[model samples]
Target chain A: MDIKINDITLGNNSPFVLFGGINVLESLDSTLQTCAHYVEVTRKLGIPYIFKASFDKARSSIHSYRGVGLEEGLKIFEKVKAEFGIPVITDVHEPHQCQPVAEVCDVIQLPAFLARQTDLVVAMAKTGNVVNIKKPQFLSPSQMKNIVEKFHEAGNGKLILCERGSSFGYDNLVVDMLGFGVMKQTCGNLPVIFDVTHSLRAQALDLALAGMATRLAGLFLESHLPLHLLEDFLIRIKALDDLIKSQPI
Target chain B: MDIKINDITLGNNSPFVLFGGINVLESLDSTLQTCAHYVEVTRKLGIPYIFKASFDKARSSISVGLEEGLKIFEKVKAEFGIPVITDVHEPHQCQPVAEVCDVIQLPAFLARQTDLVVAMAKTGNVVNIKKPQFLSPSQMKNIVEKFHEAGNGKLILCERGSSFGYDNLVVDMLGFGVMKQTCGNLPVIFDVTHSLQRAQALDLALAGMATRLAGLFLESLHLLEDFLIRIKALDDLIKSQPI
Candidate 1:
């Protein structure tokens, strides 16, 4: 039950294809440099690559952040594919942004918030593009099947399911390994990825709190890990390993 | 049924008790002033006071912070007899701290962390604790019994709902009501403050990354409002009738 995204194939039987790439859009030269560096790194690590950046970050809190708009970001992606001869991936927010971005990206990513957006899912699928949908941290893994079914209905069988941590407490996220197994079963044949960097972001915020009492009290439980400290680093690695072992598939 | 912590009783039939106090331990003057201010505020709001502070922050990430030590427990209890509450993480950490702190709190995140429960319950003092949102309401029955078995059957239950989508939590008021029912006759409470935390920390952190693709790819969802709204909804649903 292996699924292919570009040249890399991932499934229960295959060695987990660890894909790493830049998630930000940059100027053509800068984008190329970043992608080239990661391409080399991925090759060295012998991990598959899925170069991802979003054409537009629709849900950004602040107004002034870099979204690269749509046109320029797509052009930069186009140049990446042309110059490097490598398949590239980028995310889309709105339904209309799907086709245009799909033109440049080998795989089109659907933001977690928009995972439930039926119109956007159909639009991305209609492009005959490989869709990698980031499940909302709020949604249970079992619920992702409906999202996958949309792509299947559109006759676009190429898809990937990415596991980001779910909400734990106020402004906290927890990575449930069970979610990966559940999603794999529900979205059968769709490769599932454990997004490590985003998972670490939850812990980083916990350590940055002002007072040590609050920080310590917050860390008292096994749930939320502090990111800045090395203790959590080891704990996270071990927890992740334990989670992987618990996966049913 | 209502559960008593010191003189303060919390249950569906009783008015909600609001807790106020800081985590830091300062000079006697500052502590008195803070306690007095909290008393004044709760009085103005017409809510019962449970003077809350961390007598011993057993779960600190680093050793070098304001722990309030154990000495302040007697001070808080004496100065603010209004039921001084603090959390104890270990079983041995309970007795000495519980000797002074009126209501020994079991931290919610460690609700399922077994050893802490046995330690706090063995003291045979009144215990006020929160259920980890991760566990179901029925699961709290085991927690209540564990405390009762530890020799302190007097337990105060608090609801701080389970983690929902990333950076958000949802309180099932129904779960709250059910937990009370499952406990047969235990006091169940709700924490409205910390439950309202927003998921913006990641958005703010990722915004600092210099890479354009990385920054653009990070989406900011206002998931905190979901929990806030749900809390209000729970309040509204509960307020309509007597339980």
Candidate 2:
């Protein structure tokens, strides 16, 4: 299933969407500045793009600093979409935040921890918005079917599954190339995206390209690359996604 | 930290507890019949024993839900007179599960769930936290702290294996010590069935015991009695040595 976000078509067979941005909403000035860089770079490569960030970043400890709270964060997101005329994506943690978030954000993400929470899933589903389910690190690819069914049962099918590396040992993550295909097969070929946040060191480009080579629907990135390297990073990603999608599955 | 479940004491230095049983409860008679073998083997070998199985095996692979699963566990514990260990998936299932189960397990994938951790902790029963295959040993500190802060301290860390790549798992032998030192020396157990190839089960179990784990969790296979004999010998030898 290809999810339509504005004019951008996000599907496994289409050109890969670049769901890229800073990890958190810093400030209006910094966010738009960052989004401008991503927009310019992605547009140059002819890659479909959706800006992503966490309004309230869910951390392991509740004590960690969450980004701008939902209200102000959505305001900033509204600005990004208004100025750039591009679709925006952000993560939603609690059930109450879903309605308000979906109004501004083009896609509401189900965080790995809250992915299985029923109320949040239904709430996100009821929004009638596109959802990006971040695959939990501890969960296997096949388990994603239950989540997909939950959304489908709620009468929402605009879903994208995002794989952020599974636990490798301790404090480490490994992006299993086979998992992408498993999820697509298990979930009736829903568009699958790869989040290259925790799975990279200096080999960010390699991991991103490798995941794309697995025939992904999009790349979910958090700008670990220097701003200047963004274009170069997307260049290889575009070539691989284009190469892979150009062929029949 | 040493965890006591009924009469059996689980610690990194103590003789390893054999947390073994069938993978699922096929039926009351079959489960009891299977658990009888585990009890008999462990008794003959003089190994500390806990009859383990899943009520909700479908969470990993049974159609068993919590209530029906608990009914079977209750019979197993009553008949065998041994402690029972079982995995619980949902937060709401924790309290009822802890009522009958001696050890309530937090599954590897759901180990990071705060609500489940808090619920399981409040049960005040001994806990076997399965190390998430994607998580590093050092990160277990946070999990331990979650339980400790939630007001329960009886904790054991179990290693199944880390993800080697796609569709495979590798047991990092050193993770045992990393967990012991990092998580306040809690009892560390090796789950050999899920981590390594079946042909290497004995080799993997023996090797994991050499790292000085607190217990071994295994699924039934042919010659588990012989398997227990070898495991008891190694665990006894390893426990005899000083850290």
Candidate 3:
């Protein structure tokens, strides 16, 4: 299935597209500021980019900061769309939000926990918009076929599967590289993608430690954690990539 | 991918052959009797045989002297006159060990020890690589490439298990197929015996280990014959090596 959001073509075979921005829109200025950094980096790297952030985060703590209301969120999306001319992607908490949210946002994201819900799947499918399906952390990669089939049964064909890390035992998350390849084979050849998000805890530079972290993050795309914790590491990988390119070996 | 031991051809592409034996030569008498039972079971089952015993297990307290091991190895080959496999640690041992051994095996823990690989490869005995429990199955391919680069074409891939956590090893059944695919269809065998041996000590209750391996073999529905063949070998092995 080929899905095009604005000018960027997303297919199983096309080049990877970046689905990124702040994890949530706590305040308009901060959200936009984070997005500006994202836009600058992705543009400078020449990757196909899409801006994403939550209007209201339902899963946050009782005292955790949620985003601005839908009306204000849509206005921010409209402004970002107008200013940057970039496609916006965001999650819709309610079915009622999809129609209006789909108006400004070029693509809709379904919360992984609710990816199987009948009403939400219908709401997003009815918008006639492309969907970015976050492969659930609690689910197996092969089980993703059900979510894809759910969207298609709702009569939506254009879909992208984004894998964050899966839970390994309790705290650690493992990126199963072979499982990602299996998802492509099982999910009707829909485009498969890696999506990463984490806290800002930074650490030391042991190769084994970096190696363990890279394997954990390898399955995800557009690691926001990097701009915080992994900045030096990603830079080093690039430096090493450059160093390899420079080497005659 | 196709590794020939004596007249027997072993590969994932063919009927599985038994690479069964004790971990090391426990003693002169124990080694011969144990190898004798393994040889008998293979003959009874008509599976290809390779008599295996480490002459020197430098990393283990449960080991035999290398000279005593070479003496047993020569006698086993002279007695059974079949292909024999034993692991060598130091570079010098490779030449003497390879002289009697038809296939020189690589230790799973020391798999990427470059000097050891270079020494064994230079001897030109066929190689059997035991997948390290710490590394991913995909990492096995790079090691296979290393052997090929060192001018060794006869290669076999054996999987022990992967460390699920400290002191916990997981032998995911999917890895056997992954090794075969990534290593270009090289013969991939399961060494769950050796795997479990390391997880604890190799001294006792292999009945439980054999039963554990029996379930995985049963799980691989296509290889039912392999399960039956292996269990009988395990039965005779566990029955013979009384701790």
Predicted structure with the largest TM-score when compared to the true one: 2
Native contact share for candidate 1: 0.12
* Candidate 3 clash pair list: A194-A220, A194-A221, A195-A220, A195-A221, B1-B186
Candidate scoring better on DockQ of 2 and 3: 2
**lDDT tens per residue, model 2, B1-243:** 787778888888998888888877678888988888888887888888898887643322101566788899988877879998888776788999999998999988777667688899999999989987777788888889988888989998889888765557888888888999898898899889878734489889999999888899877745888788888888889889877
Question: Model 3, range A170-207, lDDT digits (tens) per residue?
Answer: 23566665665677779877776666452102432333
TM-score of candidate 3 on Cα atoms, chains taken together: 0.44
- Every model's Cα RMSD, please? 22.0, 5.5, 22.1
The digit string of per-residue lDDT tens for model 3 on B1-243 reads 566677887754444556666666768787778778766755767666677776554422111567778888888788787887888755667888888789888877557556567788888998888886656677788788777777887888776766553335666666655666687877666665655622132222233334222111111132324454645556556435532
Each candidate's fnat: 0.12, 0.30, 0.00
Candidate 1's C-alpha runs over 4 A off are A58-61, A201-249, B1-243
Residue-wise C-alpha lDDT for candidate 1, range B57-129, written one tens digit per residue: 3322213122345566567667767877777655566888877777788877556545567778778777877
TM-score list, all predictions: 0.45, 0.72, 0.44
Residue A185, model 2: lDDT of 88
Ordering by TM-score: 2, 1, 3
How accurate locally is residue A131 in candidate 2, as Cα lDDT from 0 to 100? 94
Interface RMSD of each: 19.2, 5.2, 24.3
Candidate topping lDDT: 2
- Name the lDDT value of residue A89 in candidate 2: 89
Better of 2 and 3 by TM-score: 2
After the best TM-score superposition of candidate 3, give how far the Cα of residue B192 lies from its true spot, in angstroms. 34
> Which lDDT tens digits does candidate 1 get at residues A53-133?
655552222223445779988888788877767777777755677888877788788767557756677788899887777
